Amino acid sequence: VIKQVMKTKLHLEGTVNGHDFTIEGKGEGKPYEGLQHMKMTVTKGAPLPFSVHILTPSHSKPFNKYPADIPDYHKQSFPEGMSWERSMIFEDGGVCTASNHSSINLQENCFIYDVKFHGVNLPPDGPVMQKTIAGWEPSVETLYVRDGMLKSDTAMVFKLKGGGHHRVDFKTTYKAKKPVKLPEFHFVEHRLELTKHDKDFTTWDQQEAAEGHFSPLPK
Amino acid sequence: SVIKQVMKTKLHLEGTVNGHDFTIEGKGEGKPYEGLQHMKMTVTKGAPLPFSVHILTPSHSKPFNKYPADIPDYHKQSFPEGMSWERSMIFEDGGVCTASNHSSINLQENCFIYDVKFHGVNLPPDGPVMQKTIAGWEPSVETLYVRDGMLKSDTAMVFKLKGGGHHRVDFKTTYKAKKPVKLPEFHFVEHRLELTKHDKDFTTWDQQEAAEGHFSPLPKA
């Protein structure tokens, strides 16, 4: 059911700093190569009063490159689908929660994402509300099974405009709708980039490269 | 350079975990440019330890990181003046450990001297640390970046439970060179710490660690 090239369609409803908004995404990628892109459009609540970088990682699990000896938890869950849930704890008290439902439209060869996003206690002079985030650095995600689900940890660090970094702890749970071959403990390299946009970020292009692997260090 | 292809290590650690005082003494060796090292630990006071010794193994040597030419080695550059590190370890079950070190060098002995403090609090009595159900650490990837001229890091250090399953410990570490050094850009460090040999009650044991720094292998557009 997962072809060498596949489309994506996203619908996200969010509330950040008491500001409601709807985002619509349309993209495509090479699932087995771990490459994908998507064009976002803030259909409601534009212009957003916060850094859109807090939302970019909440916009696609079937596009992770994996070796043959690591079962792909996400690809195996389709066509039944999966869901993912996540908490994002910032260094300054800010907390965002995101959750998704991923399904497939076999006719269109397109993945359907329905996402919820909630941002609270973002400090008014912090980098999210002040829009001083330049983008995310690449990241290494650590994944292991917990209760038959795939749990992961990621110190997702963003670059500040003017230099310096700010860490956001991501705790995610991936939940396949039907049982799949569970993988052993492993890592996923991630590089998320916001490449093009209009002046006030009502529309933008975001891409992601992702590769799973065991530790390269010998025992 | 003051850092040779082969270097010795000497460690002294004083700790208090679950209100239990103890001292560890370490003696080891490694290849600083290859990112390989090993240390023989001995609990000189407070043996046998009433908790899993795995909580202490990452507190026992920053001059032993392999780095490419385009990533300045923050730790090696800090010698002979030395460096120090500080760390918090937050467990999934409320347990908190804090560790801090002072690293110096004995140029005549070609030996790094480590003085360590360790404190463990609120470890649940039926948790994996007090129940000694930790089999060891999994390999890890640490993320490093500069903050106030110091080198900060974040590592989800996950340990394997005996009988399967995992338990995450959030490590927040700060490395502090005593004199200014060429600071590196944001990067990662692969770690694989292994406890390879020991006596029945872990009064002595052999610990080793492979560590390699690198930027992300993924291409940037």
Residue numbers in the entry:
A (entry chain C): 3 to 61, 65 to 224
B (entry chain A): 2 to 61, 65 to 225
Excerpt from the paper describing this PDB structure:
Anthozoan chromoproteins are highly pigmented, diversely coloured and readily produced in recombinant expression systems. Here, high-resolution X-ray crystal structures of four open-source chromoproteins, gfasPurple, amilCP, spisPink and eforRed, are presented. Like GFP, chromoprotein monomers have a β-barrel structure that contains a chromophore, which is autocatalytically constructed from adjacent X–tyrosine–glycine residues encoded within the protein sequence itself.
The chromophores are trans and noncoplanar in gfasPurple, amilCP and spisPink, while that in eforRed is cis and noncoplanar, and also emits fluorescence. The reddish appearance of eforRed can be attributed to its intense, red-shifted fluorescence emission that peaks at 602 nm. Studies of photo-switchable fluorescent proteins indicate that coplanarity is more essential for fluorescence than a cis chromophore conformation, as fluorescence is also observed in mutants containing trans but coplanar chromophore variants. The other requirement in fluorescent chromoprotein variants is thought to be a histidine (His197) π-stacking with the tyrosyl moiety, which is observed in eforRed but not dsRed. Most notably, an unusual hydroxyl-to-methionine hydrogen bond was observed in eforRed between the tyrosyl moiety and Met161, while the equivalent Met159 in gfasPurple and amilCP only forms van der Waals interactions.
